[PDB]
Design an enzyme around this catalytic site. Structure first.
Site, PDB file in Angstrom:
ATOM      1  N   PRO A   1       0.384  14.895   2.410  1.00 52.71           N
ATOM      2  CA  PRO A   1      -1.048  14.317   2.098  1.00 52.71           C
ATOM      3  C   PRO A   1      -0.924  12.956   2.511  1.00 52.71           C
ATOM      4  O   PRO A   1      -1.658  12.089   3.091  1.00 52.71           O
ATOM      5  CB  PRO A   1      -1.326  14.827   0.918  1.00 52.71           C
ATOM      6  CG  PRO A   1      -0.734  16.035   0.883  1.00 52.71           C
ATOM      7  CD  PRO A   1       0.594  15.892   1.372  1.00 52.71           C
TER       8      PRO A   1
ATOM      9  N   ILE B   1       0.746  -1.126  -0.027  1.00 55.58           N
ATOM     10  CA  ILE B   1       0.048  -0.014   0.151  1.00 55.58           C
ATOM     11  C   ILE B   1       0.879   1.228   0.068  1.00 55.58           C
ATOM     12  O   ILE B   1       0.249   2.471   0.235  1.00 55.58           O
ATOM     13  CB  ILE B   1      -0.753  -0.083   1.111  1.00 55.58           C
ATOM     14  CG1 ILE B   1      -0.198  -0.140   2.562  1.00 55.58           C
ATOM     15  CG2 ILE B   1      -1.906  -1.182   1.179  1.00 55.58           C
ATOM     16  CD1 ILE B   1      -1.028  -0.062   3.867  1.00 55.58           C
ATOM     17  N   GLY B   2       2.026   1.236  -0.059  1.00 51.41           N
ATOM     18  CA  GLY B   2       2.986   2.305  -0.304  1.00 51.41           C
ATOM     19  C   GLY B   2       4.385   1.902  -0.308  1.00 51.41           C
ATOM     20  O   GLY B   2       4.618   0.747   0.012  1.00 51.41           O
TER      21      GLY B   2
ATOM     22  N   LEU C   1      -5.445   2.023   8.445  1.00 51.23           N
ATOM     23  CA  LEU C   1      -6.704   3.166   8.026  1.00 51.23           C
ATOM     24  C   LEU C   1      -6.681   3.094   6.603  1.00 51.23           C
ATOM     25  O   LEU C   1      -5.888   2.710   5.855  1.00 51.23           O
ATOM     26  CB  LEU C   1      -6.182   4.681   8.165  1.00 51.23           C
ATOM     27  CG  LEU C   1      -6.629   4.858   9.979  1.00 51.23           C
ATOM     28  CD1 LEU C   1      -5.569   4.537  10.914  1.00 51.23           C
ATOM     29  CD2 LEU C   1      -7.001   6.485   9.889  1.00 51.23           C
TER      30      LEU C   1
ATOM     31  N   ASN D   1       1.008  11.198   4.322  1.00 49.31           N
ATOM     32  CA  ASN D   1       1.224  10.499   5.610  1.00 49.31           C
ATOM     33  C   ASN D   1       0.047  11.091   6.414  1.00 49.31           C
ATOM     34  O   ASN D   1       0.360  11.057   7.866  1.00 49.31           O
ATOM     35  CB  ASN D   1       2.546  11.382   6.128  1.00 49.31           C
ATOM     36  CG  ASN D   1       3.609  10.706   5.494  1.00 49.31           C
ATOM     37  OD1 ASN D   1       3.921   9.576   4.874  1.00 49.31           O
ATOM     38  ND2 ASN D   1       5.018  11.365   5.591  1.00 49.31           N
TER      39      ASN D   1
ATOM     40  N   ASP E   1       7.986  15.304   8.537  1.00 48.88           N
ATOM     41  CA  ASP E   1       7.749  15.001   6.957  1.00 48.88           C
ATOM     42  C   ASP E   1       6.343  15.044   6.617  1.00 48.88           C
ATOM     43  O   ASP E   1       5.794  14.141   6.144  1.00 48.88           O
ATOM     44  CB  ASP E   1       8.443  13.907   6.728  1.00 48.88           C
ATOM     45  CG  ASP E   1       8.529  13.781   4.958  1.00 48.88           C
ATOM     46  OD1 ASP E   1       8.622  14.741   4.333  1.00 48.88           O
ATOM     47  OD2 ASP E   1       8.574  12.795   4.612  1.00 48.88           O
TER      48      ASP E   1
ATOM     49  N   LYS F   1       5.137  -1.887   8.097  1.00 50.84           N
ATOM     50  CA  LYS F   1       6.056  -0.998   7.563  1.00 50.84           C
ATOM     51  C   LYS F   1       7.562  -2.132   7.592  1.00 50.84           C
ATOM     52  O   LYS F   1       7.893  -1.922   8.939  1.00 50.84           O
ATOM     53  CB  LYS F   1       6.156   0.333   7.873  1.00 50.84           C
ATOM     54  CG  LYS F   1       7.056   1.138   7.015  1.00 50.84           C
ATOM     55  CD  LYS F   1       7.150   2.636   7.763  1.00 50.84           C
ATOM     56  CE  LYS F   1       7.369   3.752   6.456  1.00 50.84           C
ATOM     57  NZ  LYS F   1       8.463   3.334   5.534  1.00 50.84           N
TER      58      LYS F   1
HETATM   59  N1  LIG Z   1      -3.235   4.722  -1.348  1.00 47.80           N
HETATM   60  C1  LIG Z   1      -3.908   3.736  -0.574  1.00 47.80           C
HETATM   61  O1  LIG Z   1      -4.796   2.966  -1.238  1.00 47.80           O
HETATM   62  C2  LIG Z   1      -3.573   3.617   0.737  1.00 47.80           C
HETATM   63  C3  LIG Z   1      -4.393   2.279   1.444  1.00 47.80           C
HETATM   64  C4  LIG Z   1      -4.264   2.372   2.917  1.00 47.80           C
HETATM   65  C5  LIG Z   1      -3.407   3.016   3.808  1.00 47.80           C
HETATM   66  N2  LIG Z   1      -3.484   2.910   5.120  1.00 47.80           N
HETATM   67  C6  LIG Z   1      -2.304   2.927   5.852  1.00 47.80           C
HETATM   68  N3  LIG Z   1      -2.446   2.709   7.344  1.00 47.80           N
HETATM   69  C7  LIG Z   1      -1.192   2.971   8.023  1.00 47.80           C
HETATM   70  N4  LIG Z   1      -1.335   3.013   9.123  1.00 47.80           N
HETATM   71  C8  LIG Z   1      -0.421   3.668   7.173  1.00 47.80           C
HETATM   72  C9  LIG Z   1       0.970   4.124   7.580  1.00 47.80           C
HETATM   73  O2  LIG Z   1       1.095   3.703   9.061  1.00 47.80           O
HETATM   74  C10 LIG Z   1       1.964   4.739   6.924  1.00 47.80           C
HETATM   75  C11 LIG Z   1       1.753   5.860   5.894  1.00 47.80           C
HETATM   76  C12 LIG Z   1       2.881   6.413   5.047  1.00 47.80           C
HETATM   77  C13 LIG Z   1       3.811   6.032   5.335  1.00 47.80           C
HETATM   78  N5  LIG Z   1       4.253   5.242   6.207  1.00 47.80           N
HETATM   79  C14 LIG Z   1       3.283   4.363   6.931  1.00 47.80           C
HETATM   80  S1  LIG Z   1      -0.615   3.560   5.542  1.00 47.80           S
HETATM   81  C15 LIG Z   1      -2.652   4.088   2.907  1.00 47.80           C
HETATM   82  C16 LIG Z   1      -2.795   4.316   1.705  1.00 47.80           C
END
Ligand SMILES: NC(=O)c1ccc(Nc2nc(N)c(C(=O)c3cccnc3)s2)cc1
Length: 294
Positions: free
Chosen positions: A126, A10-11, A79, A128, A123, A33
């Site tokens: 959006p 997801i990232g 989330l 984050n 840092d 992560k």
């Molecule tokens: N773009 C998406 O579809 C998407 C879907 C679900 C997510 N959900 C995420 N949940 C958590 N807890 C995240 C992080 O803790 C995180 C965020 C950024 C960098 N490192 C860690 S990202 C975020 C993005």
């Protein structure tokens, strides 16, 4: 991941890759992560281990920290969407002002909390900022340059975004203050309002000059000490400050006033998260629920 099951990637943050995963045992769904490689500092893992106690409704909960094989795994509550995706999804119509205000208010609460505990994010962007169906927004990632540093990319060739970086960082200040987070959040606030990044720099100097072209090249009058900064050059072009009403139309005067205080050049004049929460802009704040498509 033996104990999990990388549902999906997801990232790819500025340190590693983030996965959606299910705890095969508890069945809970989390964001996992993975962090970079030759032993991994023990000073950081202690800095990290310190974040586990930093619990607030507007801060993504760090559930577990796991060090094993030059690999550091951070387990966070999951989330469903980030603000970057939500803004892109709301580009045609715009995020309603009441939701923009709710999100800004909540993020300032989260920052007031971190800052009072001497924790800097460093840092904010959006990507984050995470949101849920109930209308909450939470701070995620937290960088960790005090326990790691600013990566050349992320971990494997990736263009780090400079769009939200405070000017004192761009000018070489070696010691960041909590003011850097207020600057980033001000940039994000503007972007939610106009549906366009405020300062979309594609290099450090272009980032700095985009800031100067809009807010005016800083001088000793508005920013005492600026000409003595590490990367300040007397040769910087001298741009006049733009009328603020042209930067974030059609935001109302309360909103402009608050944004102007979050974007003051002098880190010491920049409004604090605590003080921002008291700004008149929030007199009628509420907590709308967003229309999320997951
Ligand atoms: N773009 C998406 O579809 C998407 C879907 C679900 C997510 N959900 C995420 N949940 C958590 N807890 C995240 C992080 O803790 C995180 C965020 C950024 C960098 N490192 C860690 S990202 C975020 C993005």
């Amino acid at each position: 991941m033996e104990n999990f099951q990388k549902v999906e990637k997801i990232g790819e943050g500025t340190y590693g890759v983030v996965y959606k995963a299910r705890n095969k045992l508890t069945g809970e769904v989390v964001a996992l992560k993975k962090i970079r490689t030759e032993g991994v500092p023990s000073t950081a893992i202690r800095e990290i281990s310190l974040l586990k106690e930093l619990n607030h409704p507007n801060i993504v909960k760090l559930l577990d920290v796991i060090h094993t094989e030059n690999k550091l795994y951070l387990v966070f509550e999951f989330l469903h969407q980030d603000l970057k995706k939500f803004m892109d999804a709301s580009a045609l119509t715009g995020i309603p002002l009441p939701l923009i205000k709710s999100y800004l208010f909540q993020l300032l609460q989260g920052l007031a909390f971190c800052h009072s505990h001497r924790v800097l994010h460093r840092d904010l962007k959006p990507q984050n900022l995470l949101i849920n169906t109930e209308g909450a927004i939470k701070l995620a990632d937290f960088g960790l340059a005090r326990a790691f540093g600013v990566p050349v990319r992320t971990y494997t060739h990736e263009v780090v975004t400079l769009w939200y970086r405070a000017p004192e960082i761009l000018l070489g200040c070696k010691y960041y203050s909590t003011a850097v987070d207020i600057w980033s959040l001000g940039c994000i606030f503007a972007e939610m309002v106009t549906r366009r990044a405020l300062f979309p720099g594609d290099s450090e100097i272009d980032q700095l000059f985009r800031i100067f072209r809009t807010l005016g090249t800083p001088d000793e009058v508005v920013w005492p000490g600026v000409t003595s900064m590490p990367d300040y050059k007397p040769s910087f072009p001298k741009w006049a400050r733009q009328d603020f009403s042209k930067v974030v139309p059609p935001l109302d005067e309360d909103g402009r006033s608050l944004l102007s205080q979050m974007l003051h050049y002098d880190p010491n004049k920049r409004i604090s998260a605590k003080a921002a929460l008291a700004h008149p802009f929030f007199q009628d704040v509420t907590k709308p629920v967003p229309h999320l498509r997951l």
